[PDB]
Write a protein that binds this ligand. Structure first.
Ligand SMILES: O=c1[nH]c(=O)n([C@@H]2O[C@H](CO)[C@@H](O)[C@H](O)[C@H]2O)c(=O)[nH]1
Ligand SMILES: O=c1[nH]c(=O)n([C@@H]2O[C@H](CO)[C@@H](O)[C@H](O)[C@H]2O)c(=O)[nH]1
Ligand SMILES: O=c1[nH]c(=O)n([C@@H]2O[C@H](CO)[C@@H](O)[C@H](O)[C@H]2O)c(=O)[nH]1
Ligand SMILES: O=c1[nH]c(=O)n([C@@H]2O[C@H](CO)[C@@H](O)[C@H](O)[C@H]2O)c(=O)[nH]1
Lengths: 810, 810
């Protein structure tokens, strides 16, 4: 059908059809008479999977032959989403499979919707790991993703009575055709026990054993025949476990609960023992696997030359003391040599400066669960502080500020300090974020070892986030500049010479209108809700959090509603405001924000006077697959976090690449996006980081804004009086109280400028031609935000390896 | 290689090899360089499985087209063992696969040993269900086996310090290539709740829901292209289950524990709630499946004409009240009509008369877990007793004896009485057993409804128990009379005309010697233990129980040892005594019997004076796969249960079919075996049932035997003094006490005759030629014990269907 989807050759279509029928018969054990849509989906999945195996086997054989330096990306989250379409795109099989299924009398798009999302992540951090794996394979790096195979991923969100309800994400229910169990590589992981100090070295004994069984999933690079591996560990009890008889067998569940479920917290630390076990479980199994592969290449001096370990946040921070344990206790290396190897092998990526998100584990927990690691951490701390004392003699406060051990109510271990001390590189995820790290929270560390600190601005993969979710846009672009940009996004700059091209302007606007019509139809199909496709699609999708300020968006929506009610027969640019995202189960305020959104919609969407001029819809169960649908249909991207709180943001990049203009604060990657496109082509507003600091020094008083802004006062009075909750007048009392007395994120402070800025947005939308020309200027300069650029920087500046765009023989 | 293993055609061997390589590549994702023996086993399993699918799909389509009466065999146990070789045998692919793997440079026998046994059963009862499925498919019946897919089957037995140690049987660890999940047929099962009586009928509400997910396994008939289905249910929690968040997800384990593990009790009732849940779980899911299939053929009058439900023991007895519940509460049929349909649909098989094995569930348990079923059971009881009262006016004691409800400490429901009342046929499993049912335990019921009682003597499948485990014997037999006997075992009688044939006599003896050499080698291979292949292989394998009297065997062994020590230089026929079997985890006496066996071996096997004249070995982890190895190598089969206790026995039939002579009591099927072969060709000894009754009436006093038999007294004194347990002199005090003061099975009473009989056995073994001629007379008359004969009788006399030997187009 479309160019960028590859060729539909005669031979290939014929081959695909016969293999599809073979799998339906032999694999699914069914015939066309009793086969269900799900049966057809699996028949197609197995058919596409077959095309991966050959490349998968030779890629790994290749690495064995060439023995290049290996990159190990450790993360407790991999937000993969669906795999079928992504695999077809990277193998250039989309059109052939589309044709083949068509001839079999089937609609491939219908079958694609049957696949469950692999929701092994919460949001940005988990998605970043997924985009990175794609880019590493596309850049020919010998990379491996290591994580946990959660039985239950992020919960499915249901909205009942306007409230969020959570239900288990049993994604493995019907089976996963993409994974391959490798029980032959099962490894033992130890817990509890005690430390014995013998003649030669310490020994960790009397431990409880839990087995780690790996499951491998293929990660195909973009049309380069490279297929890397994502290995996820599953917990298994040993057969002699607890061995009444029946009860002993049933208690196996205890040990296996380790890989049962993903903790649903986004940017928030919850110090639960089960979480600590998950963190050590992935680290312990992964390192044994790494060392095994290394020995199968005694000379640990060359370990850093053949191995690079990237820690995604502090979640896998235990890799540092665990590597020391193995080298010192098992391999018998002297401490100094072991430490040298560890530091040169490990690199750490920091993701958010919010204090409530930092991992600080109680010493009593580590003491009971990992006694040897606690001892190693104390020793690391002792030697690190000796270095600090020698560099800054007499600076006693610096010593306590930098310690890995925090004193107080309960002693805790600051995992971020542990990661900085044991890594040769520490990076932030956006220029402004990395600068904040050096200027504030890690100032002491930067002064001691300035060379360790770097910046690696985040990115997104243009495969899933353009070609896959927005084929129409990828096509009109390819028509003008070719297909090379798909793996070299910087080439999009060539589109700048088309900003005045009437044909192009018209095509860009047509693609957007088509995406909006498709999404508008989807809303009625699966969610039965009417919306006007001619309105401006104003969307904010991301996890619900106070710092992301979905509340500021709500205030604007209510402002628009009150203005309309005041002057009913006055023209206003029609808008469909869409807000979506999940709230962590125990985050009360976030759950109240969701209720507020649906409550506003209940009032606005049923007011006769408003008509189709304003609609407020809450996008239920926002996840990767839904993002792929709504982002291509958006006109306006809301990135309005308080300056200095959003480390980077990645959703913002997805919107920019798909033809939406951005309204946001100078926070995270927004700053670099505006810099790339030009501030005149971005809708910037609000306080800058410096402004926020000035306000804090002075003392933030929300009352002041309430007293001086009539429109704001009206809104707060409506909320307090029960205007949006008739049967429950004080339902939103907690929200009003927080906004008025303890708003850590200064919602009111940016209210006026935000509303003003939104007016400028509506003004531009009234001029279709100029709105589109600004869109083109955004798409044309979004190249810097490809994760291929990000990974190339990690490879050269941190891992010490060169990326390759060379194809492998298929 | 051998005739009975089919042809190794040029085309087929070529096809098998390419498909084997295809699976190793695409299915296992490996190459010949990294493939392990397990990888090769799976490659072979998937290759053979492919040959099943076509026949499986058309067999089921066939039943849909012809709509024959369906037979549903409900059992909580299906002791299947391995599936690879059995599948090749029934598809006539053994030689082709042997050749194909040979050419690939692989040993098929080595690969077959890699497959895990499907140990979803405890012993005879579970194995009977497995043999039955094979015969039903071979006889072309539209039959379905319904059970539970236990995650953990019967525990693996380890012997440590002479004691039994149990370890979890994680048989699904590496995956099961034979099963096919059918999540599309997932059904809800209800528990707890309460009963609401409305205007029209009662309603079961406020229940907890557990999902039942079916897994289908193919059951191939012998070379007739028929492939039936064994459907096993797995428990799954609903996604809204219990929906802190984390804990709610982790608590899903509670509900899913239902299908977690098989209760390891053999011939013993343990009234645990979890077991009751398993029993209802299988019954509830199965009946919904049956009714669905029935409606997809309103007219429940014809239900009994299209459906037959066979209850294997009382374990699935809840099918009766559950069928009534559905018909009355859901379909709205009047009670009388519903009862008529139920009785005509259900048939019940009784398996043992031991009182401790009878299921008698506490009313308080049924009251809380299945409130509606308890009400239905009371109503059934009320109407049944009204019938009894009318038939035997004034016989008040008969009323209390026949009640389904037992009064006393705690009220209980006698499930056997429930089954008799609600079934149109009740059968015993051996002639003597069925007679005992009518004369004793079910006398009252027989007098009320004599027509209901029948006999169906057990049998074993000649496919697994001859062709598969003893190809050498099947071959020399085929050479003389053809291959027809494999599916018509009665033809073995033709071998009687070869009893004087010198060539045949020599071949029979050669095959046995070969089997013994092979087994003797196996013992050293996997268990490192030396034995003399020239000795008489005396074996007793079956679950450890007091009624089976492994203790009587022990007394004989010790007698032989004491006699040798007394007259060292006197000649005696060499023997290797082998005893094997598992003991239920909580059965103390059985565990003590195992310890006694190993203790005897410790003394006997290391006594210089004995030499290789006597060896005592305990066969560890006795299971189906081990039975297939030891039975073909046996010379003497020990079937020595106290007369009247072994309902039938089936191991006895396996030994008779494989060339071993039998020493046993006139109990269970032993009586019919001796009758078929002729008492002169059997080694019968001990009390008959009538003798046991006389002793009980008089009062059994073990002391008498001890006082009058010097050799017996010596043995008991050795046991008491610590002769077999030096470091622990009183280790066997419990055994001696039981034998002397409360032996329910009269071990001493049969001691003298047993030892005398064993002397006659040794006398015959000294004459190779005559021993073999007697063996031939046994094999020649073992035809009656084929499960094909058993199933043909069930089909004609109970289910109302005609068996067919017609092939289906492949
Ligand atoms: O994901 C979450 N983010 C949050 O900000 N919180 C918040 O943490 C605060 C510090 O303990 C509490 O005071 C708040 O009541 C709580 O909502 C959560 O409980 N969960
Ligand atoms: O637990 C967390 N979850 C997250 O999603 N993040 C996020 O990681 C992203 C990738 O670097 C950043 O772009 C986001 O700004 C950050 O909030 C965190 O920093 N921490
Ligand atoms: O499988 C088993 N078979 C048994 O015979 N027993 C027996 O049941 C008897 C009745 O309660 C007890 O008195 C015995 O001590 C026990 O070993 C078991 O505990 N388990
Ligand atoms: O729990 C039980 N397990 C058993 O193995 N049996 C057995 O079932 C067999 C098949 O009918 C019989 O041949 C055995 O004699 C009987 O003990 C029972 O009767 N009960």
């Amino acid at each position: 059908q479309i160019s960028v989807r590859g060729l539909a050759g005669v031979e290939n279509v014929t081959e695909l059809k016969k293999n599809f029928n073979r799998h339906l018969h032999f694999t699914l054990v069914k015939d066309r008479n009793v086969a269900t849509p799900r049966d057809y989906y699996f028949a197609l999945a197995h058919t596409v999977r077959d095309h991966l195996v050959g490349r998968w086997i030779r890629t790994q054989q290749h690495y064995y032959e060439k023995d290049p330096k290996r990159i190990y990306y450790l993360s407790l989250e991999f937000y993969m989403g669906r795999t079928l379409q992504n695999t077809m795109v990277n193998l250039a099989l989309e059109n052939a499979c589309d044709e083949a299924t068509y001839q079999l009398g089937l609609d491939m798009e219908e079958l694609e919707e049957i696949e469950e999302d692999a929701g092994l992540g919460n949001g940005g951090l988990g998605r970043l790991a997924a985009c990175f794996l794609d880019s590493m394979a596309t850049l020919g790096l010998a990379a491996y993703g290591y994580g946990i195979r959660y039985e239950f991923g992020i919960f499915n969100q249901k909205i009942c009575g306007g409230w969020q309800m959570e239900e288990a994400d049993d994604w493995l229910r019907y089976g996963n055709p993409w994974e391959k169990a490798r029980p032959e590589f099962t490894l033992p992981v130890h817990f509890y026990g005690r430390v014995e100090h013998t003649s030669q070295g310490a020994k960790w004994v009397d431990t409880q054993v839990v087995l780690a069984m790996p499951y491998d999933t293929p990660v195909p690079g973009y049309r380069n025949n490279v297929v890397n591996t994502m290995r996820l560990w599953s917990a298994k009890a040993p057969n002699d476990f607890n061995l009444g008889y029946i009860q002993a067998v049933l208690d196996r569940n205890l040990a296996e609960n380790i890989s049962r479920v993903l903790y649903p917290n986004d940017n928030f630390f919850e110090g639960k023992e089960l979480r600590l076990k998950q963190e050590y479980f992935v680290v312990a199994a992964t390192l044994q696997d790494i060392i095994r592969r290394f020995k199968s290449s005694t000379n640990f001096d060359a370990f850093p030359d053949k191995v690079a370990i990237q820690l995604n946040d502090t979640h896998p921070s235990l890799a540092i003391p665990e590597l020391m344990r193995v080298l010192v206790d098992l391999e018998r290396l002297d401490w100094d040599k072991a430490w040298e190897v560890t530091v040169k092998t490990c690199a750490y990526t920091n993701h958010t400066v919010l204090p409530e998100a930092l991992e600080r584990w109680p010493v009593h927990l580590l003491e009971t669960l990992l006694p040897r690691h606690l001892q190693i951490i104390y020793e690391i701390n002792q030697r690190f502080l000796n270095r600090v004392a020698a560099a800054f003699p007499g600076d006693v406060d610096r010593l306590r500020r930098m310690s890995l051990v925090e004193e107080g109510a309960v002693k805790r271990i600051n995992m971020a300090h542990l990661c900085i001390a044991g890594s040769h590189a520490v990076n932030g995820v956006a220029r402004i974020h990395s600068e904040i790290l050096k200027k504030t929270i890690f100032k002491d560390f930067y002064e001691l070892e300035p060379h360790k600190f770097q910046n690696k601005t985040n990115g997104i993969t243009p495969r899933r986030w353009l070609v896959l979710c927005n084929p129409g846009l990828a096509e009109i672009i390819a028509e003008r500049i070719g297909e090379e940009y798909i793996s070299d996004l910087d080439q999009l700059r060539k589109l700048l010479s088309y900003v005045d091209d009437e044909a192009f302007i018209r095509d860009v606007a047509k693609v957007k209108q088509e995406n909006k019509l498709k999404f508008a139809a989807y809303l009625e199909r699966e969610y039965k809700v009417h919306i006007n496709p001619n309105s401006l699609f104003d969307v904010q999708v991301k996890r619900i959090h106070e710092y992301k300020r979905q509340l500021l968006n709500c205030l604007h929506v209510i402002t628009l509603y009150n203005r309309i009610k005041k002057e009913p027969n006055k023209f206003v640019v029609p808008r469909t405001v869409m807000i979506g995202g999940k709230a962590a189960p125990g985050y009360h305020m976030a759950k109240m924000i969701i209720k507020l959104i649906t409550a506003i919609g209940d009032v606005v969407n049923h007011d006769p006077v408003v008509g189709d001029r304003l609609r407020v819809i809450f996008l239920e169960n926002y996840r990767v697959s839904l993002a792929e649908k709504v982002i291509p249909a958006a006109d306006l991207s809301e990135q309005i976090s308080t300056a200095g709180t959003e480390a980077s943001g990645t959703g913002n990049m997805k919107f920019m690449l798909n033809g939406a203009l951005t309204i946001g604060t100078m926070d995270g990657a927004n700053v670099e996006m505006a810099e790339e496109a030009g501030e005149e082509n971005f809708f910037i507003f609000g306080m800058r980081v410096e402004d926020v600091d000035r306000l804090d020094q002075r003392g933030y008083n929300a009352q002041e804004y309430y007293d001086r802004i009539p429109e704001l006062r009206q809104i707060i009075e409506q909320l307090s009086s029960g205007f949006f909750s008739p049967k429950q007048p004080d339902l939103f009392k907690d929200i009003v109280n927080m906004l008025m007395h303890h708003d850590r994120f200064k919602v009111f402070a940016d209210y006026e400028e935000y509303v003003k800025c939104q007016e400028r947005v509506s003004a531009l939308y009234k001029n279709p031609r100029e709105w589109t020309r600004m869109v083109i200027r955004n798409i044309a300069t979004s190249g810097k935000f490809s994760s291929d650029r990000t990974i190339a920087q990690y490879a050269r500046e941190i891992w010490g390896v060169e990326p390759s765009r060379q194809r492998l023989p298929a």
